Coordinates of C-alpha atoms and ligand atoms in Angstrom, one line a residue:
Chain T
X1 CA -42.1 42.5 22.7
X2 CA -42.4 43.2 19.1
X3 CA -45.7 43.7 17.4
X4 CA -46.0 44.0 13.6
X5 CA -48.7 44.4 11.1
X6 CA -48.1 41.9 8.3
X7 CA -49.8 41.6 5.0
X8 CA -49.1 38.1 3.5
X9 CA -46.6 38.2 0.6
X10 CA -45.8 35.5 -2.1
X11 CA -42.5 34.9 -0.3
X12 CA -44.1 33.7 3.0
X13 CA -47.1 31.3 2.1
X14 CA -48.1 28.4 0.0
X15 CA -47.7 24.6 0.2
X16 CA -43.8 24.9 0.3
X17 CA -41.4 26.1 3.0
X18 CA -41.8 29.9 2.5
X19 CA -43.8 30.5 5.6
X20 CA -41.3 28.6 7.9
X21 CA -38.6 30.6 6.1
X22 CA -40.2 33.9 7.0
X23 CA -40.8 32.7 10.6
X24 CA -37.1 32.0 11.0
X25 CA -36.0 35.4 9.6
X26 CA -38.4 37.0 12.2
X27 CA -36.8 34.9 14.9
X28 CA -33.3 36.3 13.9
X29 CA -34.7 39.8 14.0
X30 CA -36.5 39.4 17.3
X31 CA -33.3 38.0 19.0
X32 CA -31.2 40.8 17.5
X33 CA -33.6 43.4 19.0
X34 CA -33.9 41.7 22.5
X35 CA -30.3 40.3 23.0
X36 CA -28.1 43.3 22.0
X37 CA -26.3 41.5 19.2
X38 CA -26.6 41.6 15.4
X39 CA -27.5 37.9 14.9
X40 CA -27.1 38.2 11.1
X41 CA -23.4 39.2 11.3
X42 CA -22.6 37.3 14.5
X43 CA -19.0 36.0 15.0
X44 CA -17.1 34.6 18.0
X45 CA -14.1 36.3 19.7
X46 CA -11.8 34.5 17.2
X47 CA -13.5 36.0 14.1
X48 CA -15.4 32.8 13.3
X49 CA -19.0 33.2 12.0
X50 CA -21.4 32.0 14.6
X51 CA -25.0 30.9 13.5
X52 CA -28.1 30.9 15.6
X53 CA -29.1 27.5 14.4
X54 CA -32.7 26.2 14.5
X55 CA -32.9 23.2 16.8
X56 CA -36.5 22.8 17.8
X57 CA -39.4 24.3 15.7
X58 CA -43.1 24.1 16.3
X59 CA -46.0 25.6 14.3
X60 CA -49.4 24.9 16.0
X61 CA -52.7 26.3 14.4
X62 CA -56.1 24.6 14.0
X63 CA -59.0 24.5 11.6
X64 CA -59.9 28.2 12.2
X65 CA -56.3 29.3 11.3
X66 CA -53.4 27.2 9.9
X67 CA -50.5 27.8 7.5
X68 CA -52.6 26.7 4.5
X69 CA -55.1 29.4 5.4
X70 CA -52.8 32.2 4.5
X71 CA -53.3 33.7 1.0
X72 CA -51.8 36.8 -0.7
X73 CA -52.9 40.0 1.0
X74 CA -54.2 38.4 4.3
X75 CA -53.8 41.0 7.1
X76 CA -52.1 39.5 10.1
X77 CA -50.9 40.7 13.5
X78 CA -47.7 39.2 14.7
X79 CA -46.3 39.4 18.3
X80 CA -42.8 38.2 19.0
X81 CA -40.4 37.9 22.0
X82 CA -37.5 35.9 23.5
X83 CA -37.3 33.9 26.6
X84 CA -34.1 33.1 28.6
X85 CA -32.5 29.7 28.0
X86 CA -29.0 30.7 29.3
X87 CA -26.0 31.9 27.4
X88 CA -25.7 29.5 24.5
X89 CA -29.3 29.3 23.3
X90 CA -32.7 31.2 23.3
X91 CA -36.4 30.4 22.8
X92 CA -38.3 32.8 20.4
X93 CA -42.1 32.7 20.3
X94 CA -44.4 34.3 17.7
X95 CA -48.1 34.5 17.9
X96 CA -50.1 35.2 14.7
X97 CA -53.6 36.4 14.6
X98 CA -55.8 37.7 11.7
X99 CA -55.7 41.5 12.1
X100 CA -58.8 43.0 13.8
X101 CA -59.2 39.5 15.5
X102 CA -60.8 39.6 18.9
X103 CA -58.1 40.4 21.4
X104 CA -55.3 40.4 18.7
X105 CA -53.4 43.0 20.7
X106 CA -52.9 40.4 23.5
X107 CA -49.4 40.3 24.9
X108 CA -47.4 37.1 24.7
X109 CA -48.7 34.7 27.4
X110 CA -46.7 31.6 28.2
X111 CA -49.8 29.9 29.7
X112 CA -51.8 30.5 26.4
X113 CA -48.9 29.0 24.3
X114 CA -48.1 26.0 26.3
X115 CA -51.4 25.0 27.9
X116 CA -54.4 26.9 26.5
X117 CA -53.9 27.5 22.7
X118 CA -56.8 29.0 21.0
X119 CA -58.3 27.9 17.7
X120 CA -57.9 30.9 15.4
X121 CA -54.3 31.9 16.4
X122 CA -51.1 30.4 15.1
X123 CA -48.4 29.7 17.8
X124 CA -44.7 29.5 16.7
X125 CA -41.9 28.2 19.0
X126 CA -38.2 28.4 17.8
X127 CA -35.6 27.1 20.1
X128 CA -32.2 28.1 18.6
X129 CA -28.6 27.3 19.6
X130 CA -25.5 29.2 18.6
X131 CA -23.0 27.1 16.6
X132 CA -19.8 27.4 14.6
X133 CA -18.1 24.9 12.1
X134 CA -15.3 22.7 13.5
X135 CA -13.5 22.8 10.2
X136 CA -14.0 25.0 7.0
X137 CA -16.4 23.5 4.5
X138 CA -17.5 20.8 7.0
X139 CA -21.2 20.7 8.0
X140 CA -20.6 18.0 10.5
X141 CA -19.6 18.1 14.2
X142 CA -20.6 21.7 14.7
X143 CA -19.4 23.3 17.9
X144 CA -21.4 25.2 20.6
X145 CA -20.7 29.0 20.8
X146 CA -22.0 32.3 22.3
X147 CA -21.1 35.4 20.3
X148 CA -19.3 37.8 22.7
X149 CA -22.1 40.4 22.6
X150 CA -25.0 38.0 23.4
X151 CA -27.1 39.1 26.4
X152 CA -29.8 36.9 27.9
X153 CA -29.9 39.0 31.1
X154 CA -32.7 41.2 29.8
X155 CA -35.0 38.3 28.9
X156 CA -38.0 36.8 30.7
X157 CA -37.8 33.5 32.4
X158 CA -39.5 30.3 31.3
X159 CA -40.6 27.9 34.0
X160 CA -39.1 24.4 34.1
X161 CA -42.3 22.8 32.8
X162 CA -42.3 24.6 29.4
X163 CA -38.7 23.5 28.7
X164 CA -38.1 22.8 25.0
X165 CA -35.2 20.4 26.1
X166 CA -37.7 17.9 27.7
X167 CA -39.7 18.0 24.5
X168 CA -36.9 17.5 22.1
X169 CA -35.0 14.9 24.2
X170 CA -38.1 12.7 24.2
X171 CA -38.5 13.2 20.4
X172 CA -34.9 12.1 19.6
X173 CA -35.5 8.9 21.6
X174 CA -39.0 8.1 20.4
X175 CA -38.8 9.4 16.8
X176 CA -42.1 11.1 17.2
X177 CA -43.4 14.1 19.2
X178 CA -46.6 12.2 19.9
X179 CA -46.1 9.1 22.1
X180 CA -46.9 5.9 20.3
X181 CA -49.1 5.0 23.3
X182 CA -51.4 8.0 22.7
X183 CA -54.9 6.5 22.8
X184 CA -57.3 7.3 19.9
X185 CA -54.9 6.3 17.1
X186 CA -54.1 3.2 15.1
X187 CA -50.9 2.9 13.2
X188 CA -51.1 2.0 9.5
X189 CA -48.9 -0.7 8.1
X190 CA -47.6 1.2 5.0
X191 CA -44.4 3.2 5.6
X192 CA -41.9 4.5 3.1
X193 CA -38.1 5.0 2.9
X194 CA -36.9 7.5 0.3
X195 CA -33.3 8.3 -0.8
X196 CA -32.7 12.1 -1.1
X197 CA -29.3 13.4 -2.5
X198 CA -28.8 16.9 -1.1
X199 CA -30.3 19.3 -3.6
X200 CA -27.6 21.9 -4.2
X201 CA -29.8 24.0 -6.5
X202 CA -32.5 24.5 -3.7
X203 CA -31.4 23.0 -0.2
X204 CA -28.3 25.3 0.5
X205 CA -28.2 28.6 2.5
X206 CA -25.9 31.6 2.1
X207 CA -23.2 30.1 4.5
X208 CA -23.2 26.7 2.7
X209 CA -25.2 24.7 5.3
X210 CA -28.5 22.9 4.6
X211 CA -31.1 25.7 5.0
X212 CA -33.4 25.2 7.9
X213 CA -36.5 25.6 5.9
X214 CA -35.3 22.9 3.4
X215 CA -35.9 20.3 6.3
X216 CA -39.6 21.1 6.1
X217 CA -39.5 20.5 2.3
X218 CA -37.6 17.2 2.8
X219 CA -40.2 16.2 5.4
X220 CA -43.1 17.1 2.9
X221 CA -41.3 15.1 0.2
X222 CA -41.5 12.0 2.5
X223 CA -45.1 12.8 3.4
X224 CA -45.9 12.9 -0.4
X225 CA -44.2 9.6 -1.1
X226 CA -46.3 7.9 1.7
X227 CA -49.4 9.9 0.6
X228 CA -49.1 8.5 -2.9
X229 CA -48.3 4.9 -1.6
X230 CA -51.6 5.0 0.2
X231 CA -53.1 5.5 -3.4
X232 CA -53.9 9.2 -2.8
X233 CA -53.9 12.0 -5.4
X234 CA -51.5 14.9 -5.8
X235 CA -54.6 17.0 -5.6
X236 CA -55.9 16.0 -2.2
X237 CA -52.3 16.3 -0.9
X238 CA -52.5 20.1 -1.6
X239 CA -55.7 20.1 0.4
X240 CA -54.1 18.5 3.6
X241 CA -54.6 20.7 6.7
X242 CA -51.6 20.8 9.1
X243 CA -52.9 21.8 12.5
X244 CA -49.6 21.2 14.3
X245 CA -46.1 20.3 13.3
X246 CA -42.8 19.8 15.3
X247 CA -39.3 19.6 14.0
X248 CA -35.9 18.8 15.7
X249 CA -32.8 19.5 13.9
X250 CA -30.3 17.0 15.4
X251 CA -27.6 17.8 12.7
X252 CA -26.6 19.4 9.4
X253 CA -24.9 17.6 6.5
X254 CA -22.2 18.0 4.0
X255 CA -23.4 19.1 0.5
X256 CA -22.6 15.7 -1.2
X257 CA -24.6 13.6 1.3
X258 CA -27.3 11.2 0.3
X259 CA -30.0 11.3 3.0
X260 CA -32.8 8.9 3.8
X261 CA -36.3 10.0 4.5
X262 CA -38.6 7.5 6.4
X263 CA -42.3 8.1 7.1
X264 CA -45.2 6.4 8.9
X265 CA -48.7 7.4 9.9
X266 CA -51.4 6.8 12.6
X267 CA -55.1 7.3 11.7
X268 CA -57.6 8.6 14.3
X269 CA -60.1 6.0 15.4
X270 CA -62.1 8.9 16.9
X271 CA -62.2 11.4 13.9
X272 CA -62.1 10.4 10.2
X273 CA -59.3 12.1 8.2
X274 CA -57.2 13.0 11.3
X275 CA -53.7 11.5 10.9
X276 CA -50.3 11.7 12.7
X277 CA -47.3 11.4 10.3
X278 CA -43.7 10.8 11.6
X279 CA -40.7 11.5 9.5
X280 CA -37.1 10.7 10.3
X281 CA -34.2 12.0 8.3
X282 CA -31.1 9.9 8.5
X283 CA -27.6 10.3 7.1
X284 CA -26.9 6.6 7.0
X285 CA -23.2 7.2 6.0
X286 CA -22.4 9.0 9.4
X287 CA -24.7 6.8 11.4
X288 CA -26.7 10.1 12.4
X289 CA -30.4 10.8 12.7
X290 CA -30.3 14.6 11.6
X291 CA -34.0 15.4 11.9
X292 CA -37.3 14.1 13.3
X293 CA -40.7 15.7 12.5
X294 CA -44.3 15.0 13.5
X295 CA -47.2 16.4 11.7
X296 CA -50.8 16.4 12.9
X297 CA -53.0 16.7 9.8
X298 CA -56.7 16.6 8.7
Chain U
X1 CA -38.6 56.5 -4.5
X2 CA -38.1 54.1 -1.7
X3 CA -34.8 53.8 0.0
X4 CA -34.2 51.0 2.6
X5 CA -31.3 49.8 4.7
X6 CA -31.2 46.0 4.4
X7 CA -29.1 43.5 6.4
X8 CA -28.9 40.3 4.4
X9 CA -31.1 37.5 6.0
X10 CA -31.0 33.7 5.4
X11 CA -34.3 34.0 3.5
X12 CA -32.8 36.2 0.8
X13 CA -29.4 34.7 -0.3
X14 CA -27.6 31.6 -1.2
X15 CA -27.3 29.5 -4.3
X16 CA -31.1 28.9 -4.5
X17 CA -33.9 31.3 -5.5
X18 CA -34.3 33.2 -2.2
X19 CA -32.8 36.4 -3.4
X20 CA -35.0 36.6 -6.5
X21 CA -37.9 35.8 -4.1
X22 CA -37.1 38.8 -1.9
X23 CA -36.7 41.0 -5.0
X24 CA -40.2 40.2 -6.1
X25 CA -41.8 40.9 -2.7
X26 CA -40.0 44.3 -2.8
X27 CA -41.5 44.8 -6.3
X28 CA -45.1 44.2 -5.0
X29 CA -44.4 46.6 -2.0
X30 CA -42.9 49.3 -4.2
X31 CA -45.9 49.2 -6.6
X32 CA -48.4 49.2 -3.7
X33 CA -46.7 52.4 -2.4
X34 CA -46.4 54.2 -5.8
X35 CA -49.7 53.1 -7.5
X36 CA -52.4 53.6 -4.8
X37 CA -53.4 49.9 -4.7
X38 CA -52.8 47.1 -2.4
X39 CA -51.1 44.7 -4.8
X40 CA -51.2 41.8 -2.3
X41 CA -55.0 41.8 -2.1
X42 CA -55.7 43.0 -5.6
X43 CA -59.0 42.0 -7.3
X44 CA -60.9 43.1 -10.4
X45 CA -64.3 44.8 -10.4
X46 CA -65.9 41.4 -10.5
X47 CA -64.2 40.1 -7.3
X48 CA -61.6 38.0 -9.1
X49 CA -58.1 37.9 -7.6
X50 CA -55.8 39.8 -9.9
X51 CA -52.0 39.0 -9.7
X52 CA -49.1 41.3 -10.7
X53 CA -47.4 38.6 -12.5
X54 CA -43.6 38.6 -13.3
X55 CA -43.1 38.7 -17.0
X56 CA -39.5 40.1 -17.6
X57 CA -36.9 39.8 -14.8
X58 CA -33.2 40.9 -15.0
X59 CA -30.5 40.9 -12.3
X60 CA -27.2 42.5 -13.5
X61 CA -24.2 42.7 -11.1
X62 CA -20.5 42.1 -11.9
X63 CA -17.3 40.7 -10.2
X64 CA -17.3 43.5 -7.6
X65 CA -20.9 42.7 -6.5
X66 CA -23.3 39.9 -7.6
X67 CA -25.9 37.6 -6.0
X68 CA -23.3 35.1 -4.8
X69 CA -21.5 37.9 -3.0
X70 CA -24.3 38.4 -0.4
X71 CA -23.8 36.6 2.9
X72 CA -25.6 36.7 6.2
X73 CA -25.4 40.1 7.8
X74 CA -24.1 42.1 4.7
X75 CA -25.3 45.7 5.0
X76 CA -26.9 46.9 1.8
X77 CA -28.7 50.0 0.6
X78 CA -31.7 49.4 -1.7
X79 CA -33.4 52.1 -3.8
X80 CA -36.7 51.2 -5.6
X81 CA -39.3 52.9 -7.8
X82 CA -41.8 52.3 -10.6
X83 CA -42.0 53.6 -14.2
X84 CA -45.1 54.1 -16.3
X85 CA -45.9 51.3 -18.8
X86 CA -49.6 52.1 -19.1
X87 CA -52.6 50.8 -17.3
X88 CA -52.1 47.0 -17.5
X89 CA -48.4 46.7 -16.5
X90 CA -45.6 48.5 -14.6
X91 CA -41.7 48.4 -14.6
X92 CA -40.1 48.3 -11.2
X93 CA -36.4 49.0 -10.7
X94 CA -34.2 48.2 -7.7
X95 CA -30.6 49.3 -7.2
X96 CA -28.5 47.5 -4.5
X97 CA -25.3 48.9 -3.2
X98 CA -23.1 47.8 -0.2
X99 CA -24.1 50.3 2.6
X100 CA -21.6 53.1 3.0
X101 CA -20.7 52.5 -0.7
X102 CA -19.4 55.6 -2.6
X103 CA -22.5 57.5 -3.7
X104 CA -24.9 54.8 -2.4
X105 CA -27.5 57.4 -1.7
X106 CA -27.7 58.1 -5.6
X107 CA -31.3 58.4 -6.8
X108 CA -32.5 56.0 -9.4
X109 CA -31.1 57.0 -12.8
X110 CA -32.4 55.4 -16.0
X111 CA -29.3 56.3 -17.9
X112 CA -27.1 54.4 -15.3
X113 CA -29.4 51.3 -15.3
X114 CA -29.8 51.0 -19.0
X115 CA -26.5 52.3 -20.5
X116 CA -23.8 52.9 -17.8
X117 CA -24.1 50.2 -15.2
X118 CA -21.3 50.3 -12.6
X119 CA -19.3 47.3 -11.3
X120 CA -20.1 47.2 -7.5
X121 CA -23.9 47.8 -7.7
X122 CA -26.6 45.3 -8.5
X123 CA -29.4 46.5 -10.9
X124 CA -32.8 44.7 -10.9
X125 CA -35.6 45.2 -13.5
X126 CA -39.0 43.7 -13.0
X127 CA -41.6 44.1 -15.7
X128 CA -44.9 42.9 -14.4
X129 CA -48.4 42.5 -15.9
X130 CA -51.7 42.2 -14.1
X131 CA -53.5 38.9 -14.9
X132 CA -56.4 36.8 -13.7
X133 CA -57.4 33.0 -14.3
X134 CA -59.8 32.3 -17.2
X135 CA -61.2 29.4 -15.2
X136 CA -60.9 28.2 -11.6
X137 CA -57.9 25.9 -11.0
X138 CA -56.6 26.5 -14.5
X139 CA -53.1 28.0 -14.8
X140 CA -53.3 28.3 -18.6
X141 CA -54.7 31.0 -20.8
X142 CA -54.5 33.8 -18.1
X143 CA -56.3 36.9 -19.0
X144 CA -55.0 40.6 -18.9
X145 CA -56.5 42.8 -16.2
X146 CA -56.1 46.1 -14.3
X147 CA -57.4 46.2 -10.7
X148 CA -59.9 49.1 -10.4
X149 CA -57.7 51.1 -8.1
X150 CA -54.4 50.9 -10.2
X151 CA -52.9 54.3 -10.9
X152 CA -50.0 54.8 -13.3
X153 CA -50.6 58.6 -13.6
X154 CA -48.2 59.4 -10.8
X155 CA -45.3 57.5 -12.3
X156 CA -42.2 58.6 -14.2
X157 CA -41.9 58.0 -17.9
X158 CA -39.6 55.6 -19.6
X159 CA -38.2 56.6 -23.0
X160 CA -39.0 54.3 -26.0
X161 CA -35.4 53.0 -26.1
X162 CA -35.5 51.5 -22.6
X163 CA -38.7 49.5 -23.4
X164 CA -38.7 46.0 -21.8
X165 CA -41.1 44.9 -24.6
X166 CA -38.4 45.2 -27.4
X167 CA -36.1 43.2 -25.1
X168 CA -38.6 40.4 -24.3
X169 CA -40.1 40.2 -27.9
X170 CA -36.6 39.6 -29.2
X171 CA -35.9 36.9 -26.6
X172 CA -39.2 34.9 -27.2
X173 CA -38.1 34.8 -30.9
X174 CA -34.4 34.1 -30.5
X175 CA -34.5 31.9 -27.3
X176 CA -31.7 33.9 -25.9
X177 CA -31.3 37.4 -24.6
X178 CA -27.8 37.5 -26.2
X179 CA -27.8 37.4 -30.0
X180 CA -26.2 34.3 -31.4
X181 CA -24.3 36.6 -33.7
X182 CA -22.6 38.3 -30.7
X183 CA -18.8 38.2 -31.6
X184 CA -16.4 36.9 -29.0
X185 CA -18.2 33.6 -28.3
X186 CA -18.2 30.1 -29.6
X187 CA -21.1 27.7 -29.0
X188 CA -20.3 24.4 -27.4
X189 CA -21.7 21.2 -29.0
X190 CA -23.1 19.6 -25.7
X191 CA -26.6 20.7 -24.8
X192 CA -29.1 18.9 -22.5
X193 CA -32.9 18.3 -22.4
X194 CA -34.3 17.4 -19.0
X195 CA -37.8 16.3 -18.0
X196 CA -39.2 18.1 -14.9
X197 CA -42.6 17.1 -13.4
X198 CA -44.0 20.2 -11.5
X199 CA -42.8 19.9 -8.0
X200 CA -45.8 20.4 -5.9
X201 CA -43.9 20.3 -2.6
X202 CA -41.6 23.2 -3.6
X203 CA -42.7 24.9 -6.9
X204 CA -46.3 26.2 -6.0
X205 CA -47.2 29.7 -4.6
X206 CA -50.1 30.6 -2.2
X207 CA -52.6 31.1 -5.0
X208 CA -51.8 27.7 -6.7
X209 CA -49.7 29.0 -9.6
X210 CA -46.1 28.1 -10.3
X211 CA -44.2 30.6 -8.1
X212 CA -42.1 33.0 -10.0
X213 CA -38.9 32.3 -8.1
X214 CA -39.3 28.5 -8.9
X215 CA -38.5 29.4 -12.6
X216 CA -35.0 30.4 -11.5
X217 CA -34.6 27.1 -9.6
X218 CA -35.8 25.2 -12.7
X219 CA -33.3 27.1 -14.9
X220 CA -30.5 26.3 -12.4
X221 CA -31.6 22.6 -12.5
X222 CA -30.9 22.7 -16.3
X223 CA -27.7 24.6 -15.9
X224 CA -26.6 21.9 -13.4
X225 CA -27.4 19.0 -15.7
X226 CA -25.4 20.7 -18.5
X227 CA -22.6 21.6 -16.0
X228 CA -22.3 18.0 -15.0
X229 CA -22.5 16.7 -18.7
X230 CA -19.5 18.9 -19.4
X231 CA -17.8 16.6 -16.7
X232 CA -17.7 19.4 -14.1
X233 CA -18.1 19.0 -10.3
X234 CA -21.0 19.9 -7.9
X235 CA -18.4 21.9 -6.1
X236 CA -17.3 24.2 -8.9
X237 CA -21.0 24.7 -9.7
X238 CA -21.5 26.4 -6.3
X239 CA -18.5 28.7 -7.2
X240 CA -20.1 29.9 -10.5
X241 CA -20.4 33.7 -10.6
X242 CA -23.6 35.0 -12.3
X243 CA -22.8 38.6 -13.5
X244 CA -26.1 39.0 -15.4
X245 CA -29.3 37.0 -15.8
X246 CA -32.6 37.6 -17.8
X247 CA -35.8 35.7 -17.5
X248 CA -39.1 35.9 -19.6
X249 CA -42.1 34.3 -18.2
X250 CA -44.2 33.5 -21.3
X251 CA -46.7 31.3 -19.3
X252 CA -47.7 29.4 -16.2
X253 CA -48.6 25.8 -16.0
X254 CA -51.1 23.4 -14.4
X255 CA -49.8 21.6 -11.4
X256 CA -49.7 18.1 -13.1
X257 CA -47.6 19.2 -16.0
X258 CA -44.4 17.7 -17.1
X259 CA -42.1 20.3 -18.3
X260 CA -39.0 20.1 -20.4
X261 CA -35.8 22.1 -19.6
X262 CA -33.3 22.6 -22.5
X263 CA -29.9 24.2 -22.1
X264 CA -26.9 25.2 -24.3
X265 CA -23.7 27.3 -23.6
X266 CA -21.3 29.6 -25.5
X267 CA -17.7 30.0 -24.3
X268 CA -15.8 33.3 -24.5
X269 CA -12.9 33.2 -27.0
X270 CA -11.7 36.5 -25.4
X271 CA -11.8 35.5 -21.6
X272 CA -11.4 32.0 -20.1
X273 CA -14.2 30.9 -17.9
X274 CA -16.7 33.4 -19.3
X275 CA -19.8 31.5 -20.6
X276 CA -23.4 32.4 -21.8
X277 CA -25.9 29.7 -20.9
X278 CA -29.5 29.6 -22.5
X279 CA -32.4 27.8 -21.0
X280 CA -35.8 27.2 -22.5
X281 CA -38.6 25.8 -20.5
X282 CA -41.3 24.1 -22.6
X283 CA -44.6 22.5 -21.8
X284 CA -44.6 20.1 -24.7
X285 CA -48.2 19.0 -24.0
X286 CA -49.7 22.5 -24.8
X287 CA -47.1 23.3 -27.4
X288 CA -46.0 26.4 -25.3
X289 CA -42.6 27.8 -24.5
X290 CA -43.3 29.1 -20.9
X291 CA -39.9 30.5 -20.1
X292 CA -36.6 31.6 -21.6
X293 CA -33.5 32.6 -19.6
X294 CA -29.9 33.7 -20.4
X295 CA -27.2 33.7 -17.8
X296 CA -23.8 35.4 -18.2
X297 CA -21.4 33.5 -15.9
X298 CA -17.7 33.4 -14.9
Ligands
COA301 C1 -26.8 22.0 18.0 C2 -25.7 20.8 17.8 C3 -24.4 21.4 17.5 C4 -25.7 20.1 19.2 O1 -24.6 19.2 19.3 P1 -24.7 17.8 20.0 O2 -23.7 16.8 19.5 O3 -26.2 17.3 20.0 O4 -24.4 18.1 21.5 P2 -23.0 18.5 22.1 O5 -23.3 19.9 22.7 O6 -22.7 17.5 23.2 O7 -21.9 18.6 21.0 C5 -26.3 19.8 16.8 O8 -27.5 19.2 17.3 C6 -26.6 20.4 15.4 O9 -25.5 20.6 14.6 N1 -27.9 20.6 15.1 C7 -28.3 21.0 13.7 C8 -28.7 22.4 13.6 C9 -29.0 22.8 12.2 O10 -28.2 22.5 11.3 N2 -30.0 23.5 11.9 C10 -30.4 23.8 10.5 C11 -29.5 24.9 9.9 S1 -29.7 26.5 10.9
COA302 C1 -48.9 37.7 -19.3 C2 -49.6 36.7 -20.3 C3 -51.0 36.5 -19.7 C4 -49.7 37.4 -21.7 O1 -50.6 36.7 -22.5 P1 -50.2 36.5 -24.1 O2 -51.0 35.3 -24.6 O3 -48.7 36.5 -24.3 O4 -50.7 37.8 -24.8 P2 -52.3 38.2 -24.9 O5 -52.3 39.5 -24.2 O6 -52.4 38.4 -26.4 O7 -53.3 37.1 -24.4 C5 -48.8 35.4 -20.4 O8 -47.6 35.7 -21.0 C6 -48.5 34.7 -19.1 O9 -49.6 34.0 -18.5 N1 -47.3 34.8 -18.5 C7 -46.8 34.1 -17.4 C8 -46.6 35.0 -16.1 C9 -46.3 34.1 -14.9 O10 -46.9 33.0 -14.7 N2 -45.4 34.5 -14.1 C10 -45.0 33.7 -13.0 C11 -46.0 33.6 -11.8 S1 -46.3 35.3 -11.2
CL303 CL1 -30.4 28.1 7.7
CL304 CL1 -45.6 33.9 -8.0

């Protein structure tokens, strides 16, 4: 496992997608270190660039520590490592604690991540799958790969129960990561449906796909539209606390697409100001759901 | 001076502002290392957070190497160091070469940066000034500072001719970094003027100011509007080569501002497809020009 001391920089915090962007770069580094392949320059046998695409992404914090807690110069301890998911994919976990936290030097513990998460630590799960394009300049119909050098044989095992697959399968079906039958919540009747042309000035990565962190900005763009429709103020929006968020990346899209962003919310009937917001990103033209996200806020 | 081996990551390339975002984080690190102060957590004697704000920013490359050249997994060598600009500000330079480039291990050379820049290296100049807010939650009327611990006494001297001040003074007056009387260019008659409400989902940093790299996205948003008005295609826009770009940050803005982005272009009468594009960002409500940028493209 990889432990690092991190002081929070402008390029990894704030109300945008910079933190999630840093998290994914750490993911690519941690896999490179544990899987004997340079993930950044990865190509298949043929010479085709192969990308370790984000597929399932979770960030879980709490009141004591969440992404909105991080400010310039915060001292953090980050512990990272991969878990075996076979030859075509890999799960990467990252734990973040405030430096000099009680027990901050803890090693990665699957039981802690999946069943006993502590208020005051941030837990990150990135389930990634190697992909290539099926055709130059197309971002649709990407094809599963495994770069020749990729080695999952050194990695620790994950037990069947902690499988990200069961998690994301259920989310693609239900369009939420939190079952509608969860007790202690009531749906609100206002929803929103926003058109979003791909933003080529902002949304595009260095290999001409939609950048994984842009999905989090698109999701927040929908949350904002629904926030506003509820009457609420730009100001209180920036005060929103996100204690948990899950994202499934079902597809990418060509750079001329017009996407649709739909959002709904359930309000706690147990705690005031606790809310579960569901966002679905569709590419209506290809009949594809390309993303689903649930956000647990306060 | 600080030399690093860098492999290009998703979080520092592409047609957005991720490269400039990485450049500024390197700036804050390099000053922290050469000036005996933790720039990330900097505060004045009073306890007030003090920010090493970007004020003048230049990225100069060329055909052989420019920001659009960088792709995932590119091996680079980066050399960084600061130069004395007194007690309230500091100039940071970064040179970027392809790793195993001829002479890539070169030390920083002011003569090379300012008068003999080589095709095949990227030269970055960041002139930064320490500032604090004048009032909580206000992004206007920021006030000059120097964190108690800041030390410029170890740093190398810059000769009067290489002064970023003369450069940026002239740009605030002329609204371009390339004098209108430059021979070998003809102005085009199409210009554009776009309204841009501050984007709170994207544009905001972890201390609630407009993030310095967002200015580059706002500038590109104006370049795009003018690009399109010239008839041109989203596709050719992504093929634009930027061989040089300068930015002056005259102010910040409150998070409810509606900004105006104006753009014009001069076409080479010496080379086809060589163009100089000028963008001015105004906050009409406060009567303030907050940014000016010139881009030399191909
Ligand atoms: C991973 C992926 C190729 C799986 O393909 P699929 O059609 O669901 O399943 P098959 O393996 O049957 O083909 C597809 O879900 C996908 O392209 N996901 C998007 C990943 C992505 O773009 N992430 C953001 C950029 S890294
Ligand atoms: C630096 C600054 C305070 C200088 O103030 P000024 O009014 O030009 O000059 P005075 O020193 O006379 O006051 C002002 O130009 C400024 O606030 N610049 C914006 C810097 C910025 O926001 N950068 C992006 C975010 S880091
Ligand atoms: Cl990406
Ligand atoms: Cl900033």
